[PDB]
């Protein structure tokens, strides 16, 4: 007999999978061996970043009176944020459109 | 004797493009690097080669930026480089966004 | 008769197309262009529909970014209309040539 | 039968714990998956290079800490570091 399994995600309080990240780190040919605390830290960072982006995208979707996030909302959330835009400066999001911006010179006066 | 404005600038361009030495004084750059670094960790020590590498990279970056800025200034039918051209070059390169 | 003063329906077009996410190049001619270009590198190639779709999305995103850059280049020259020299300057400063 | 892995379950759990009355489209789930994979690859690659630079052969939390500090800008990194450290401390507490 043995104790009931407790997933390492449950142990750390996270939502993202600690075990899957551990396997991907080990099988990804990044180093000869992987420390026990590395998957937990990586999963926590990924969970935080996804939570941030999804919170901003949900706010943007609520601004559009829509209850589902679509790539346009992700694009708006990512570009409206200076630090997130800096992180994803070179990333292209399909079906995202562009941020509406017209140079002040072009506008009529 | 008095050279008309512009000729000395051209010969200076031909001189500094031909030569390969560093153009910023060594000691003030050392001090600038040291005082910038103290905002991250105190009582830091710097290898001399580290300061030299920082100076080389900084001068290369500034020279490339000035090339792009001169291109932008000439594009606007001007020959005088202006901070607007620096801003435009930085944004098009992607350093301002 | 009623005619909009030039520029206004150009501004309305800007707002119409910066709000939407749809593709701006017709799908069939772009697919034919992609196949014609790919015939140079290997004969009798087959394309997944997702591959052509991704190529189109990337191409129009790149073109939109290039058009923002050349609009900035044109405005920096104190003019509104964008000319091929503006595109060339943008590409040169971006480092693509 | 083959199996294709994805972060859809976890991304949706995070969404439902940050916006309990909001959904997400499949074409946006794919983009979130791609973002997760991209950030995973960036951090893991930086950690591998950090281990190689110092002649270590193990990837620990310190390597990922420094990778996070290197990659994420500003307050994003400042908060990711705190989240990771808190998660690791809670994991070791058990």
């Amino acid at each position: 007999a043995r104790a009931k399994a407790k997933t390492r995600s449950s142990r750390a309080g996270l939502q993202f999978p600690v075990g899957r990240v551990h396997r991907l780190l080990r099988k990804g040919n990044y180093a000869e061996r992987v420390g026990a605390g590395a998957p937990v830290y990586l999963a926590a960072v990924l969970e935080y970043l996804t939570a941030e982006i999804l919170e901003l995208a949900g706010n943007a979707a609520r601004d559009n009176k829509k209850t589902r996030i679509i790539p346009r909302h992700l694009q708006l959330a990512i570009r409206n944020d200076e630090e997130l835009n800096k992180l994803l400066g070179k990333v292209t999001i399909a079906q995202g459109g562009v941020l509406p911006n017209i140079q002040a010179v072009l506008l009529p006066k | 004797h008095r050279y008309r404005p512009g000729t000395v600038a051209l010969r200076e361009i031909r001189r500094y493009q031909k030569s390969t030495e560093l153009l910023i004084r060594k000691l003030p750059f050392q001090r600038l690097v040291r005082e910038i670094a103290q905002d991250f960790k105190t009582d830091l020590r710097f290898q001399s080669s580290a300061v030299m590498a920082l100076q080389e990279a900084s001068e290369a970056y500034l020279v490339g930026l000035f090339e792009d800025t001169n291109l932008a200034a000439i594009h606007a039918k001007r020959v005088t480089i202006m901070p607007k051209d620096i801003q435009l070059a930085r944004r098009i390169r992607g350093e301002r966004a | 008769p009623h005619r909009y003063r030039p520029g206004t329906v150009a501004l309305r077009e800007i707002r119409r197309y910066q709000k939407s996410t749809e593709l701006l190049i017709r799908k069939l001619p772009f697919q034919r262009l992609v196949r014609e270009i790919a015939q140079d590198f290997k004969t009798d190639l087959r394309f997944q529909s997702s591959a052509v779709m991704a190529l189109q999305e990337a191409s129009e995103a790149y073109l939109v970014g290039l058009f923002e850059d050349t609009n900035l280049a044109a405005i920096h020259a104190k003019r509104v209309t964008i000319m091929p020299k503006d595109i060339q300057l943008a590409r040169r400063i971006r480092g693509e040539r | 039968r083959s199996r294709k892995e994805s972060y859809s379950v976890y991304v949706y759990k995070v969404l439902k714990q940050v916006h309990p009355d909001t959904g997400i489209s499949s074409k946006a789930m794919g983009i979130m998956n791609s973002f997760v994979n991209d950030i995973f690859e960036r951090i893991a690659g930086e950690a591998s290079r950090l281990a190689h630079y110092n002649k270590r052969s193990t990837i620990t939390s310190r390597e990922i800490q420094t990778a996070v500090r290197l990659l994420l800008p500003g307050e994003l990194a400042k908060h990711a570091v705190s989240e990771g450290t808190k998660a690791v401390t809670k994991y070791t507490s058990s």
């Binding site: 309080g13 935080y48 939570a51 941030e52 919170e55 901003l56 570009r79 409206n80 944020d81 200076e82 630090e83 997130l84 835009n85 941020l99 911006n101 140079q103 002040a104 010179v105 | 607007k84 801003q87 435009l88 944004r91 301002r96 966004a97 | 900035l72 405005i75 920096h76 104190k78 | 714990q17 940050v18 309990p20 500003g74 307050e75 994003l76 400042k78 908060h79 989240e83």
Partner: peptide, 24 residues
């Protein structure tokens, strides 16, 4: 206040993007 239903787990003041304005 921005937060997660597990607080200050998210940065409570995201920075706004700025854009370049050429000309005057």
């Amino acid at each position: 206040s921005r937060g997660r239903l597990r607080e200050s787990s998210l940065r409570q003041r995201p920075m706004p993007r700025l854009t370049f304005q050429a000309g005057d």
